[PDB]
Amino acid sequence: SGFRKMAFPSGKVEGCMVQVTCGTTTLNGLWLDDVVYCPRHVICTSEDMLNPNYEDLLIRKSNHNFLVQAGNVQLRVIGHSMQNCVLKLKVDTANPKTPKYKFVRIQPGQTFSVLACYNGSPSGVYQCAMRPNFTIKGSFLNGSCGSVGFNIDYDCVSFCYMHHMELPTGVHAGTDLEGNFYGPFVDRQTAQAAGTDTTITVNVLAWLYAAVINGDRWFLNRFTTTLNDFNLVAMKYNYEPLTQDHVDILGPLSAQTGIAVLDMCASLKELLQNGMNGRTILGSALLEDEFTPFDVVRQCSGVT
Amino acid sequence: SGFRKMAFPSGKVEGCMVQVTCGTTTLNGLWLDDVVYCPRHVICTSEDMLNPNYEDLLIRKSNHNFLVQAGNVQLRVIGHSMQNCVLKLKVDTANPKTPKYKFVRIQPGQTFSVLACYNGSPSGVYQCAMRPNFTIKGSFLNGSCGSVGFNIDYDCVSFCYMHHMELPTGVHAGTDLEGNFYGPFVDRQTAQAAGTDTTITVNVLAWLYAAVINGDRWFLNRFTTTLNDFNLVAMKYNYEPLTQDHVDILGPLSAQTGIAVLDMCASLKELLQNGMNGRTILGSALLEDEFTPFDVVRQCSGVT
Ligand SMILES: Cc1ccncc1NC(=O)Cc1ccc2nc[nH]c2c1
Ligand SMILES: Cc1ccncc1NC(=O)Cc1ccc2nc[nH]c2c1
């Protein structure tokens, strides 16, 4: 028993982190096979970030200008190319620690682990979610760019995020490993404001099921609702609309606990309208939305 | 910017996890050098746990009864001994992945990362604190015993916890790596109730400093207090008494932010008396106490 905000074990990803320096800029790179992936803004100075022309800045860089270091040993760069907002640096040595991997582009509401790194060295690991406005709320200082987000399925690492930007509001933006930004964000230091950060309803419901499984049941009530009625309340509270697809995804948790999805929606509706009244659920005083239904099943069943 | 509940990168610890089976019981072991450490209750059945005589149960076990498996390869057990509540299984092969390590016994209020494992396989990593009542609030299912807690200082892993028990209330109890339980708990399935789970005041203050550094400042007020006055309010709210040692420990955060420790105590006192009023601090609706002052400095400076 007990339910924690849990990240995936980071070892497989630690074995892929390298330091990339170009000019005066140092950030992190991800070394998979004989390619090192990193944000293309490694070629910029802070002044260039105001209005960068990446193709033009890149023409002035040669393979020998990209310094790639794995631990205390230097990697030889034999090619470089720009793919969307990432650079792919071809090196002469395959990473011997390359795990089985995939590149996946996640949807908003999906969770992943981030291995925060500086100078190609891991500092920590935390769990987060792709917000509905395509930002993430991470912990990233100068030099953390190129740190990655991932999920693991037994022995295959699915990389889904690479850190690029901190918006003027302190939230974060980045790309998938094909270099396409999540949402409308760009790798330029300009006015980029995020949209409404709505709450991921399906994740809140999954977490309420985790609370019932792990003993916290005070919020269960004598009511039910419909998807349409629940969604009127969800709209009012800046929650994402709940769909029949989300109800189907919650089916296994509903079956395990014997609490119908719409009855849990009615508990959630009352929590939204009445508040917590100074009470807590799984050690939280707010409705937690950074656990997917899959995360709840995985943690409650101990998948390794 | 941004502040997250961050665990240490777990790779160095993943390389030490093994599966230990004795009879019908399987749990995790920690393989460092040529010794595998695991809870001595691996020798018990669930029925034995009601009233175990560990010395007597152990007499019936030989080296060949402890099955130790690292990945898919078996380790040969050439000796076994009981040290307090842990078994030390001497194996014929040193763990080639043994990191630099120490065994440390932490104090209440200190934080650490846990690598939750099942069948010697890592499932996830999370950050937690040793509560003032010597319990931890983890996420542990059947088979997670032997999972460990640790801190890392550059390349040296300090192991501080090994999971043993879940109390009837759903909180967790365990030992240091010398096999001594934290607090009054025992490895017997009996009535063991935890004391008051007070809030770690010094950690709440550190987290309020992290909030100011990372932009959340609404709770700062025009007041100050004294240690004695603050402690009267701390007593009322089941917070640990704040000492001059804690004030000294918060000195670097006070210097960085320019907010005197006693002024932050006055902000905390008002938060205790008035509540949050539906507001949040670093994404939390409660006062977070599982970040030490050292954690706040480490995360805010990007130590790798
Ligand atoms: C500063 C920071 C902190 C956390 N996360 C991201 C960042 N960086 C940015 O937002 C853009 C940036 C800023 C200066 C750069 N110089 C070369 N490349 C650069 C990219
Ligand atoms: C069940 C559990 C879940 C999470 N954390 C710990 C536990 N186990 C216990 O509290 C004691 C126990 C219970 C049966 C045992 N059989 C052999 N050894 C045993 C030890």
Swiss-Prot record, chains A, B:
Subunit details: 3CL-PRO exists as monomer and homodimer. Only the homodimer shows catalytic activity. Interacts with host FBXO22; this interaction promotes the proteasomal degradation of nsp5.
> In this UniProt entry, which residues form the Cytoplasmic topological domain(s)?
1-304
Organism the protein comes from = Severe acute respiratory syndrome coronavirus 2
Briefly describe activity regulation.
Inhibited by pyridone-containing alpha-ketoamides compounds 13a and 13b. In turn, alpha-ketoamide 13b (tert-butyl (1-((S)-1-(((S)-4-(benzylamino)-3,4-dioxo-1-((S)-2-oxopyrrolidin-3-yl)butan-2-yl)amino)-3-cyclopropyl-1-oxopropan-2-yl)-2-oxo-1,2-dihydropyridin-3-yl)carbamate) inhibits SARS-CoV-2 replication in human lung cells. Inhibited ex vivo by michael acceptor inhibitor N3. Inhibited ex vivo by compound 11a and 11b.
Function recorded in the entry: Cleaves the C-terminus of replicase polyprotein at 11 sites. Recognizes substrates containing the core sequence [ILMVF]-Q-|-[SGACN]. Cleaves and inactivates human TRMT1, preventing tRNA guanine(26)-dimethylation of tRNAs. May cleave human NLRP1 in lung epithelial cells, thereby activating the NLRP1 inflammasome pathway. May cleave human GSDMD, triggering alternative GSDME-mediated epithelial cell death upon activation of the NLRP1 inflammasome, which may enhance the release interleukins 1B, 6, 16 and 18. Also able to bind an ADP-ribose-1''-phosphate (ADRP).
Query: Where do the Peptidase C30 domain residues begin and end?
Result: 1-304
Protein name in the entry: 3C-like proteinase nsp5
Q: Give the positions the UniProt entry annotates as the active site.
A: 41, 145
Chemical reaction(s) catalysed: TSAVLQ-|-SGFRK-NH2 and SGVTFQ-|-GKFKK the two peptides corresponding to the two self-cleavage sites of the SARS 3C-like proteinase are the two most reactive peptide substrates. The enzyme exhibits a strong preference for substrates containing Gln at P1 position and Leu at P2 position
Result of altering residue 132 to H: In strain: Omicron/BA.1, Omicron/BA.2, Omicron/BA.2.12.1, Omicron/BA.2.75, Omicron/BA.4, Omicron/BA.5, Omicron/BQ.1.1, Omicron/XBB.1.5, Omicron/EG.5.1
Domain of life, per the record?
Viruses
The subcellular location is: Host cytoplasm; Host Golgi apparatus; Host nucleus
Q: Which residues of the full protein are shown?
A: 3264 to 3567 of 7096
What happens when you mutate residue 189 to A? Does not affect ability to cleave and inactivate human TRMT1
The location annotated for the cross-link Glycyl lysine isopeptide (Lys-Gly) (interchain with G-Cter in ubiquitin) is 5, 90
**What result follows from mutating residue 49 to A?**
Does not affect ability to cleave and inactivate human TRMT1
